[model samples]
Target: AGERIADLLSRMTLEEKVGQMMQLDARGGDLEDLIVNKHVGSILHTSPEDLSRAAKTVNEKTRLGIPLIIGDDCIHGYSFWPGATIFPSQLGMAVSWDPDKVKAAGRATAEEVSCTGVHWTFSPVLCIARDTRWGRVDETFGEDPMLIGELASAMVKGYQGGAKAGEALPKNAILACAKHFAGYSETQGGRDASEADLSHRKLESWFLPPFERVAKEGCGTFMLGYESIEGVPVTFNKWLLTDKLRGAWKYNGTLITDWDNIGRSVWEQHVKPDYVHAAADAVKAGNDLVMTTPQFYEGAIEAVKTGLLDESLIDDAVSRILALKFRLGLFEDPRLPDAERIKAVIGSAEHQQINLELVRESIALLRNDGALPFAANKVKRIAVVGPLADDAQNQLGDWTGNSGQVSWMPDGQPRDMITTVLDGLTQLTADDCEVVYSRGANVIDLVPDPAGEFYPDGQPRPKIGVSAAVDQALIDEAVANARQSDLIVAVVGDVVQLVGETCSTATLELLGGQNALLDALAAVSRETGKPMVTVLISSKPQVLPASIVGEYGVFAKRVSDPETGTGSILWAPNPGMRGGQAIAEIILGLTNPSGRLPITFPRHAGQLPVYYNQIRGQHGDRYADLTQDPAFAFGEGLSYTTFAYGEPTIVGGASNADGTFAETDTVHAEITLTNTGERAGVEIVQAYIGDIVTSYSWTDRELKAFQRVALEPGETKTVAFEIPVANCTIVDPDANRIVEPGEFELLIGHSSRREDLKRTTFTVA
Candidate 1:
């Protein structure tokens, strides 16, 4: 492959080499003209038909026969493709904590994407979410670095078909990108693309670990973040891009910038005066592909002439870009236009079932009374009320066909294909129960605000209006429906506009008139003596109100504490496409809810940094009015059936008084989990390690390992986790990574909350 790349480089001119460094958007100028004249190497956001024409033009019309590598923000499932099997958001999938399921979703997504002639998926976001106000938290794999690394590495293997960077991609696979390279999640004020104040030590300790894990596991590509750390933009950060990624880590894959990164740096960031300086700095810093920065084509050519940038750097970038194309098998076959295969895999039953299963597993049961898992006989009538009950697009979430980011998908995805909560309940209970639904209030105002930031192409963002008042007429009608029903399922949470990139919310409270809708439903529940359940179909962990607004003039705690009803809550994080069906199965007792919380839910927005892994604080842990604790702790979830865990035994490695161990030593623990309830169920057995003492402050406990186990009534299974002393390593104030010799506690339990754990101590030497 090196010989082939060198041969291609030897035959190319300076203009041809510069073209490979420029990755342009599929829109703007003529794509055919760019390929033929400008020598553009890669294109993003292309249709199957558009790609075929571009391929034909590049291969047939141009001097060079190099095939273009297609890319898109296929964050979860294939978002760019219509009718593609859309899975839940990254935060939603993290609830399962099942890497195998995540890999399967990636594999299925790749199968669908590859057939459409798209070779790369910019997915499996590797950011460790720490701030709740960050809009992209929904796209992250929770706050834990270990979970993020393992899950993202699994996705890389799935997308590239077990192939590492620079290896031949399987016919069914597409290239995977571990994105937002470093410290992008630690933005100031949780604003998207804002300044990041992460220190070099923090970068190595917290932010860089996940990217390091994926790079070692053989991910093919790395995408630059939209922000700068300290004062240097990531696009121009040579230490992060060249020294750390390329030199120290020895990553051989291609490095590409995020959309318009160079343009934003020059114009928005104001770090560079012109495109010429931006082009030289980004290339010299180690970005091989400058995405959507077409001006770079000429700017780079001029920089090379002025001796501002070395010609060898252009050759290096072009060589890596060409190598990726060869590894994708585009040289021999071009891998273009497989309409039949696209038909076979896109939205296929097998793919849909995988998504459905994922949706079921991703639905975390936050709260439940005995009233849940309703038998068909008991639920003769169900009142489905709230803004999301019949909303098809919101069910799919952002980055989908309707996300507004992908304008080519004008009207959005087909409504018949997406199953809404109303659709699922009506279909699932049609034979035995009459399911009635009402849009009690608008989720947000229907009118566009006409105003803030721009889209990817720099057009001013169309303003999304603020939340509006609930129509009393709609509330009255919904109350009428609730009066005639025995059960109420209020589908409420965030819309697409409140949760994606640059869409950060000021508060995590239920937006719009959702609370009013809940108020009216709670009133009907009291009047009719019926059970009510709230299903929060949102992107991230939201803060629930301490008290719901009463139907009258005052605010009061409802009969059941939660906004829904007394302890009957299902925190359904935006489960996609088949979410409605998956949710219906859980409510109707067809499937037990096993998903756990990957993130902690705050009681109110005041508790900003309320993640489960905060370091042990010196002060007391309570708020003035609130407890300063989460509404639901991380890894917390409920099941239709219950399970019991026996006292954990320190099986191997250490047994006596001394807990001293070497770096090579391993600690093993054996735990027995039994299905105590009279039903089949799945339980997530979690293991958290506490470094009782350290050189510096650290999180109270860090999640080391966990497993999801399936059990039937009376069934017991012994699960074991072996932890290397290396896994316990932490970075000190001096930036040294080591495992300090000290006492450690092993907490094995169902969740991260203190009460749920069974403690056992061990010493390390």
Candidate 2:
């Protein structure tokens, strides 16, 4: 079958083969027809119906019975389909450190996506984002490569479900595509697709570890990014792609080009003079696939004729494509897919349930200041304000497969069943509660922001005109409503149109006139003196002044202080469809919001480089504009009812001959946590080891282990964590990672960034 496709490709000329790899937009309806017409290799940003419908269409048309490999983004959720699962952004999940729960999220996403006919998820970003200025920081798994790798494995196992659910990975799992291939994160000043200035050692150690691990685990697909690895642009990185990935790691799966690398290398990376040479260089680099757009169908034919590329390269690309189709089992029987199965599962009720549950579980209860689990009945009135309210589109995070069918009901009328934020809010209240809504302001358009580009017309293009048309009268009316209501739930965030590969931001604060609206709402609170609940609904953490947050009870899913916590903020993955309901319940005292920051929230944007793992005392710096403190530390959370931490107990493990801890053994430290308040609560007892000899060497601490506990009023639970020598390990300049054998202080603390609560010492010889 592969040789047959290669023969046809060999006969048809270079233009046809190149067309097979490129995936530009078909932006309209009848996705399959358009895909077949162009013979495009990949399709991105479509609905479930789109993929199913398109897949069916390709079966009947393609000569060799090749299936169009469909692609849609599921970065945060399948919630891209109104009611799909939406998890907290990577920032939040990182804070939780509960990889198992996150893995479940991946599994659910994979099954739900497969049902929609999509077999791949471009996820598990391995980039150790050091610079906070980068807009795409929200996508990474934080600064720890080890954690990123572990999370990556979990995500892959979750999505691929290669094994039985909650078991070892199977080969027939959803392809977990490790992204940006390498140091696209180190874009000069954190700019995307910009130059990477790191040494090869840094690239291999920090940027390449996650990819290497995932690839070793038998991950089937590798999606190239728009940037180079080390000094080689990904499109032409022979050493990086073929050398490191294939030779060093022995990866044998398909290597696909980034969005439009063959074409983009022209003006962006300047590796080639034009599109034809760029495409040629990509083939030479061992890049087996391409995502061509804007009709390179002609240029490709000319390049082969000019001898710029060989016919053997054409065979290689076609064989790779054919191999994937065979592996996907599409070649066996490509006759029009079972329409009935497609119709039933495309956007079935089952998919929605899975989506909601996954989304809910992924949600982390970011902040609980006596304003959560609101009783829809008790509140006489509510003010729902900000740009995120009521829009089904904006709340859908990214890589959506819009699967909601405009199907006909019993009456022969077709309608889209969208259970949106608007619907969720409506279900949460009574007619008498007097619902008030407002388009106060929207968060800024951080991605593809038109303001940065100078069009040929010599004028800046506005990325998003505005999500909400802010009117002074409307603000006054909304604030007036806030003044009257018992509480206000302000939802502010973005759509997939915002944060993605091409989408990014320079700063981490609220966008547009969002800050202005916050000021307005704050004024409204002063005027009313009523309890105002500021709900932060967003993916990328916004940089809001703590002064602004301290005033009211804040209930947000994603929270971060970019200045201190290495840029990723505290994130609460969306738990379920009742996410709004969960927030509502917390506000009204229904659910005990028992979530904490997955990552640390920085104190200010000025302290752009901070995290919970950084050294303290003499090793870490205390910047001037901002102290080495987080606005909210990791594992920081407040129950409506308070809790207390008692003194910690230390136990000696088998001591070394040199009085150091054994490598195979550990120093056990335990702490007592009591929920002193009436309400029951959960707490994450964090254990951190201060490395004496390795503090300044690398920011990573010797985090041995931790335990999450539950307690009630006067109920106490003991939490334990092991302190081992590897916990004191750091990366040396020579790129050697080894345990710093010496006397180490063990800190059994309340949060990752706090050490004042409790402490002690141990030795690793």
Candidate 3:
């Protein structure tokens, strides 16, 4: 394979070599010409038939006979492909906190994507989302680095098989990318693709840990962040892409840029004066492929002629590109689209089964005042109201139907294939009860702008939502239905236009008169003594009011009452196709609600950065007027049953000369978990550690490890965790990440909240 790649490299001309490092979008232009004339290496966002044509152009038409790699933002399933099984968003999957479940979802997605003849998928985003307002917060695995690493590594293993050394990669598995490299989540004011002013210590401590873990665990590729740290755009940050990723971490995988990042050096960031300089800088900084940047073909060739870039750098990049293709076994046989295979497996029953289970496990019970697990015999009528109850498109969230406000995905996917909340509730209760639904509000009113297409950004501006308002008649109908119903389930939250890239929400309020609709529903609940259940269905987590006179009043009442409230609540974050079914099942007591909160829900948008992992050295953990606590703490969730935990026992801890744990030391802790309630359910066992003394201020407690356990009624299981001292280590002032010799508290429990945990202390030598 090495000799073959070298021989191919020897015959390629400068133009052909440079073109192999360029990736273009196939949505608009004639992709065949880019393949034949420019000899472009890869293409993105094309249909299966177009992919066959593009690859044939390279293999059969061109002199080089090299196959083109087709890449897509297959963020959640083959999002571009219609009728593919769309699982819940990443943050929703994190709610399960079960890597095995996430890995299975990834495996199912890979099977569907590979059948479409696509070579790679840019997915499994590793960025830790700390801000609720960041549009792409739904793309990450919540606010913990360890949590992100564990789940992302499982995704990588699922996407790229963990076959033995020297074994070929499984044909069904696709290349997985640990994306947006580092510091992508920590932006200025939570702005999308904005500057990330993080110190080296901060970056190493918070951001780089997940990326480093994935790279070490054999992630095949990495996508650079669009933002810059300090003054350095990641596209041109040689120290990070080369010295750190390649030199220190010894990662040899391919490096690609986020959408037009190299070009953004000149266009968006204004860091470079011309495309030529940006292209040359990006290449020298160790980028293997330039995504969606066509001008790189012209600028790179110009750079070599002007002696600005070394030809050897171009050869090295092409070598890696060709080597990846060979590793994928593309040279042996071109894996074109198999129509029969797609017919058999694409959105098949097996895939849908996993999708439903994924959705079921991820539907979190945020608050339950005995209003959930609705008694089938007791409740004769169910009133389902709000914006998302019947809206199929919004429930699927971004990356499913025309992701990121892009025009590439025109409307009309098979709506029959999706089961909306209204669809599920109506069907589930058709025999025994009556279910009535009304679209109480419109999430956003989108009016396409013809003249505003050019939005300064080089990419296409998808659409414009000129207004956000509710239909008064629909609200009236919904309230009337609620007044006559035994149980009311009001589904409200964000839409696709308000949740994806470049779609950050200014305030986390209920949008488009949803607050008004909720107010009416709450008033009706109070007036008639009927209970209401508010289901927040969005990709992004909103900072909601604790309790209002009308809207979110149940939670507000729960804050003081603790046990009883006026309503039940569920945080169903943009659950995919079968999400509606899962929601109905949980409400009907067919399945237990076991999911935890992956991200925190804030009481106010003003209290930004309300994660559980904040450093402890701050003045106080409270706001001036309000508490700095999250509305619902991280890992907070409720089940129909109850659980009790024995005091955590540390079996093998510090026995060092200085009475502290060492970097090589391994500590074992165990606890007995018993299902003390009548119903069987699942619980997420979390292990968090806090630094008693350190070279720098550290988070009050960091989630070091977690395990999802299932328990039967009256069942007892002993759950244990083996803690590596390295996992408890933190970065110093000089950015030296090492285990400091000091006292540490290892808290073990069901959630991140203080009252939920039982704590014990240990020492690190």
Candidate 4:
């Protein structure tokens, strides 16, 4: 493969080499012109037909006959493809805290994606979701770095067909990209792509760990983030791209810039005077593929001719791209779309089943009372209300269907593939009870954005989604239905317009008439004494009104609590195609709820950085007006049955007289869990580590290990954890990650809450 890449490089003209570094959007410009004339090496957002044309043109029309690698925002499932099985959002999967399920989802996505001619997926976002208002939080695996690393590594292995270091990716697998390279999520005021105020130490401490993990795990590629750190755009930062990624980490994978990063650096960021300088800096900073930057073609050519850029850098970039193609065996097979394979695997029953399992585990039961699992024979009628109860497009979340990225599938995926909350309950309860639904409220209505009629690039801007006015009539009808039903399910969340790129929200409150709708339902529940269950089918967490859960409510208190009522809340982070079915199953007791919160839920948007592992040393715990506590802490979830965790005990470790062990020593411990409730359930046992003293101030505690355990009524099981002393690490003031010998506490519990955990101390010397 090396020899082949070298030979190909020797024969390629400078034009072809520069073209190889550009990954243009297939929908933006003329396909033939970009490929044949501009000599583009890659194209994204292509339909199956366009992919075929692009592939054929590259293989047949181009001078060198190099295969063009197809890329897409296949973030969760084979997104954007009609009839492809879509799973829950990355945050949704993260709640399950199961890497194996995430890996399965990635593998299934690859099977469906590879058959459709896409060679790569920009997925498994490695960014730490710190700010709740960040629009792209749904794409991240949540707040913890270790958790992100575990799931990202698993997905990478799955997407690449378990390809280890130096192994070729399987034909059925597609390249997985670890994206938004670093600190993109550290937005100012939760603004999208805003300048990140993070220092190098802060990045090393919290942001870079996950990317480092996937890079070492042999992820095929890395994509730069859109944000600039310390006033330096990531696209132009040599220390991060070249020194850190390539020098310290020894990452050999291809590096691609995020959409229009080079172009943005010139126009939006103003870091570079012109495209020529932007292109030169991007390539020299170790970026191999420039995405969606059509100007990069001319700019790079001009830069080379004028001696602003070295031709050798272009050669190096093209060689990496060609080497990746060789590693994917694209030169021999091309992996063109196969209608038969697409028919058999795309949204296949087997894949749907896998998706269903993920959705089932992804639904986090945040609040509950005796009202759930309604007796099938006793409950005669159930009223489902809210805007998203049957909205199929929103049910699948952003990045799939009409969530704005692609031009095709304006109507979104086939309706039959998605099951909404109303659909699930209606179908699942058809035999036992009557299910009725009413559009309780409108979340948002389409309106022209005041910003402008067109984007800076001259593309006509699509209408923006804004909060809709409250409709009393809609609420009246929903209230009428609630009066006639024995139980009520209120489904509410942000619409697709409020999610994704350039859509960071200023407030996390339930948008539009949702809060008003919930108020009506809460009033009805109190008047009729019927249980009300609120299903939050949102892309990410939102602050709830006190009517739903009073004053920084974490979970539903018992009905006897005077401050709150017999109301419940279920958080389903855009649980994909099978979301509705999973919700129905959990509510009906057909399936047990087990998903936990991968991120913290704040009481108000003002609690921006409410993530569990916040660095210590804040002057005070609470704000002048609000409590510091989160509404729902990380790893928090409730099952139908109750479980008790016994104190953790060290089972294996050779401690020195000073009560310290060597850095290489493994600290093994075990905790007994007993199911105290009447039913069976799954509990995600989490283990966190806290360093007693650090060279620098650090987070109170960091998650180090976790396991999923199933226990039946009257069952007791011992869950063991083995933590290497090396795992107890902290980033020092010098921005170096090291295991400082000190006393450490191993906290084991169901969630990140302080009271829920039991700790046993150990030392590393």
Candidate 5:
């Protein structure tokens, strides 16, 4: 740990500088170890033990003992250690409109990963996808750039600490890598490696705001995307990497290239003559570090020696790398020789605190017609049915990294200890109440596409296949059990269908035989008049099996979509671990569901592209088969406690053309909420845009602003919300995104179906 910094820097040779510019894998595979051989500045993709051992080995081998910056895709919980707090993916949390919950997500993730002797996470995708064709669309908070910024800042604040660092933030969370740099989400065709063809204004506004907030929150690093802007590679675009990130934003931290991006430049995007030319281009463009197999820097050094690149560029790269190392405290505390502490931190109390809190708050209540807060004593019995209720591995979405905790199944050794939803219900019932369990049928038959690359190993790829399965005996048994109990609880939804690239459905219905189970249970509920509670553990919203066939956008022209499906071949419908427990707790009235919709649930894929906000003068066209509004609006959710909003007001209105408004020409609303039902809960206060003062003939009633607030029973709090410049403005007649210089109408809404609160008129300057 003790090294003379000046000496280390001054004595660093050109070869050493070249090595430090690269990041390798210490787990010692794929020649990523070049970070050590070539003095690679960083290491990644390793377990805590593997990383520590490799870091030690590399430290001993290097002349200057420069500790490698170990990193990994700490996307969700240390690549999946069991018992790790798994936050809902980004969009899931976004639907709830709970900033605290989102912030807690970053805090929880950081706590878990940091405790594992690791720092840095390549996450909080801060760009909006204009097209959903990209499979990665699920990786973001959805179409709104403001939502992206709000959630991104929450993450940084949660990870970096609102107070001073070293005292509050996780010590191991040394860097928050906000990435894909800019405009990566709007890839052409939603393809991962496609380009973003956007004007400078859109790039500066929608694509760059989140990253800017990342800087404001003191996030430490940025990762360039694999895509390009206007035919110029982001990794080698001087105007982008340097002029924007460094010049405009003044981000003083390191800029790491996406994995092996520098070396692949000449190979992948065909950017340069060779690895050396690519490296030089990246340097001039402001890339500080390279992540890849070694030898790329050797190419760079050769080019520098050959007079193709400058020596100062090498020095600049090495200086940034060395500076990061210094900040990591490796110069003075090089070896973190506390395995015991690392182990304690891996699944420590603090980590669990952040993790559990986030998942607890992000689960939304989509449809509960006054059938919630099911207190245990009241519900005699419950049943947990469906593929997801029993899923182990699929409980957590994809990209949890390899070599972490594998999925836990009911048949696994820890099966009994690890409770599925069924297991959770066992403890959720009353003393006399009995809980039933059944795996009615598979969600869908997963078959390996023999012709696909994922085959041979025998993996099921996406292809049209018969999905509905029925087990009358199983349904009868569940119904019989329901008849025997005062109440029945059924659990069902998507699996394997949520995360993978192959996990998509055109019909988007609640698949599998679970819908059969639902119909059977409903029959029993109607027959017995005894209440039945159904829990839908899903990724995206579902179009029900026929019973709930009403279009999500049916509300576009009318209030409820007619229930239609009856077990026939029809259109489709759309976590595990946490789902069962959360549902069980909810059924037992221990946890009131507070998760709001992150992304609106469509009634049908026919209403595929749906959102709350639309350009002015937009609505009126109904889907030939479905509707425009989603099955569930963006901020729709059911809270145990009732929320009542007061009348809304236009904070500031228009004056004369002399710009008389004090920028107060904004919509403002306050919602007074009370825990009238006794369950303390958080409510998302929502604001919608309507044409009142002036008609735009645009998209109807768009969700513009939202605020989630926590309330105690019988307690009333006034929540104030205001629309920002971005939120208030829409694309105008001039094609400029500015609040129209005219009168406007604002709406306060409870759910997207209708604005139950108030409709106020105002003028915008």
Candidate 6:
């Protein structure tokens, strides 16, 4: 395979070699022109039919007979392809805090994607979602570096069919691309693709850990972020793309640029004078593939001709691309669409069951005042209201369907595959109770993007979503129905237009008439003492109304008064196809809610960076007008049953010479938990470590380990945590990560809140 790749590289001309590095958009230009005339080596956002055609053209018409490597934005599932099993968003899955479940979803996605003739999936976004206002937050695995790394490594293994670093992928597997590499989520004022204020030390501390983990785990490809870190675009940063990723990590995986990054460097960032310089800089920076950059073909060739870029650089990139193809055995079989496999696997019953279980675990019960698990004998009529109650596309979230990434699925996924809140309630309760629904208010209405008709890359800018005016009539209808019903379930959240790239919102408030609808329902709850359930199907956390979450509420105290019946709040962040069924089950006492908050929720958007891990040393903890505490902290979730965590103790105590545990030693600790409530539930035992003092400033505490244990009523279980002393390291001022010998505190609890945790002391040498 090595000799074959070398011989092919030797035979390729400048145009052919440059084209091999260009991964153009299948939707951008003529297909035959891209593959045959331009000699493009890769294509993305392709339909199954187009993929078959492209592969055939590359094999038969091209001189080298090299197979094309097809790719897509299969973020959560086989996202764009219609009828594929779409799971919850990355944020939704993160709430489960179960790496096994996340890995299962990834494997199921690969089974569906590979059967469709796609070889690569840009998924399992490892960006630390520090800022909730960033539009792409839904795509990330939440804020903590350790949790992100754990889940990302599992997903990468699943995507590649459990293959190791030097192993070949199974026929059912597709290359997983850990994406938006390094600090893409660190936006300026929560704006998309803005300059990131990140130094090398900052990157080492929190941002790059997840990427490093996946790279070492042998994730096949990496897509660079669109942001410029410290005034240098990630695509052109040799220190990041070449030095750290290639040198220190010893990662030999293929590196691909984010959408038209080279073109953006020349046009948007204005760092490069033209495509020639941009193309040369990208090649020299160790980027193997240039995604969606059509001009890179000619620009790269011209750069080599003008003696600006060495042809050897192009040769190196092409070699890696060809080698990856050979490793996947695409040369022997391009893995074209298999009809039998597609019929058996895509949206299969087994896949749907996995998705249903994930969705069940993904629904975070934020606040409940004995309003949930509606008593079927007493509660007769349930009033389901809100725009998202029956909306199917929004339930599937940003990447799939008509989320604006592709033009193929205008109608989105199959309707029968999805179960909205209304569908779930109606179907489940038909035999015992009646379910009535009203489209209470419109969250957004489509309007022409103020940025103009086309993007910088000349792709037509789709209509953007603007908050719609509150419809008094719609609110009145919902209020009237609420007045008559025993209970009200209001599903309100963002639509697709308010999510994804270039859609960062300034305010986190519930858009349009959502707040108004909630207020009206809250008023009805106050008037008649009827219970109201506010289910947020948002892409990310939004500043909810004061009625549902009272001002200055903290931890479990934020619940609405059961006396006033202001009701319960459940946050299901784009819970995918079976989300409605899962929501219905939890609401009706059929399934236990176990999901926790992966990211923090701020009272206001002004409290922007509200993540759990904040560097020590602040004079005061509150703002003048508002408390600095989050409305809901990370790891905070309500289950049907409650558990009490016993005091934690180190097993066999740290026994090392010089009164400290060595860096190589493992610290073993155990905590006994008892289910204090009447029902059974799953408790996520969280373990955190805090350095009493560090050589440089560090977070107050960092989450190091966690366990999900299911217990019955009155059941007591001991959960053990084994943490490596090396995991307690911190990055110093010089950007070198090391474990400084010092006093360390171990915290064990249900959540990240200070009051919920119990701590003990230990020392490390």
Considering every candidate listed, which one attains the maximal lDDT? 6
Weakest 10 consecutive residues of candidate 2 by summed lDDT:
405-414
Task: List pairs with backbone clashes in candidate 4.
Answer: none
Model 1 regions lying over 4 Å from their true place: 1-9, 13-30, 429-432, 448-463, 547-567, 654-659
TM-score of each: 0.94, 0.78, 0.94, 0.96, 0.82, 0.96
By the lDDT metric, which is better: model 1 or model 5?
1
Over 1-765, each residue of candidate 6 has an lDDT whose tens digit, in order, gives 233643465444544544555444333334564455566667788865676677778777766667778888898898888899999999999989989989999999999998888889998799999898899999988899999999899899889899866567888998989888888998788889998988889998889899998998899999999998988999988778777899999998888888889999889988899999998988888888888887887888899899999988887777777777777777778889889998999999999999998889999998887877777667778899999999999988899977878878889988976999999985564566778899999988888889899999999987867899999999999988888889999999998878888888878888889898999999998788898888999999988887787765323344323432367889999999999999998888889999998999888888878999998889987777667878789999989988999999988446686566888888999999999999999999899999999878888799999998999999999999999998998998777899889899999998998788899878887
Candidate 6 Cα lDDT to native:
0.85
Q: Candidate 6 regions off by >4 Å?
A: 1-30, 429-432, 448-463, 552-565, 653-655
Over the stretch 1-765, how does candidate 4's per-residue lDDT look in tens digits? 234543464444544545555344333334565455566777778876666676677766676667778888898998889888999999999988889999999999999998888889998899989998899999999998999999999999889899865567787898889889889998788889998988878998889999988888888888999989999989888778877898899998888888899889988988889998888888778788888787888888898899999988888677777777776777777888888988899989999999998889999988876687766677889999999899999888899977878767899989975899998885564585778899989988788878899999999887767789899999999999999999899999987888988888877888778888899999989887998888999989988887876765333333223346448888999899999999988888888999999999887888778989888888877777777777788998889999999999988875666556788788999999999999999999999999989888888799999999999999999999999888889987778889898789999998998788999998777
- Looking at model 6, the pairs that clash are none
Candidate 1 lDDT over 1-765, as tens digits, reads 134653565454544544555344434223566544567777777764576677787677776566778787788898867778888888888988889988999999999988887788888798888888888888999888888887888888888889875667888988899888978887988899899988776787778888988887788889999898889988898878877888778888888888888889888998889988888988788778878777887778888889898978878777777667766767678778688898888999998989988888999987775678877676678889888887778877888877877676776777877888888885664575888888887767756445447666888666666787768888888888988888888888888878778887768777777777777776676666688777888888776543232121122232223343443778777788888887888888888998998887766666767788787664976655555656777888988888999987777775434545666788899889999998999999999998998878887788889999999998999989898878887787655678888888889989887678888877787
Model-by-model lDDT, in order? 0.79, 0.58, 0.79, 0.84, 0.59, 0.85
lDDT of 3 by residue, 640-681 (tens): 899999999888855686665777887789999999999999
- What clash count does candidate 5 reach? 33
lDDT of predicted model 5? 0.59
Model 2 lDDT per residue over 417-447, tens place: 4334444553453446766787776554334
At residue 710, candidate 5 shows an lDDT of: 79
Per-residue alpha-carbon lDDT of candidate 5 for residues 1-765, written as tens digits (9 for 90 to 100) = 355644366445644544545433233343534446666666665544455565666657666667767666655454444445555566556655667767776776776666554666777777674444444555677666667788878877766656232222346454677877878766665566667786565576457767877775567778887777787878877766766677776777677777666656677777677777776676677677777635465776786788987878677677777767676676655445355655566555665555445556656665554455566766556665556665644454455422222332222222333335676775543565676666755577655555674545567554543475666777777667667776666666665444334344556666667777777767776667666555665544566654433324334422222222211111011132354565566656677667666555556655645655554443576765555755566656676677656666555434436453334444455555666756687777667765443323345565667776778877778767776534555443332445555545667756655645477755545
Q: Counting only residues 3 or more apart in sequence or on different chains, how many pairs clash (N, Cα, C under 3 Å) in candidate 1?
A: 6
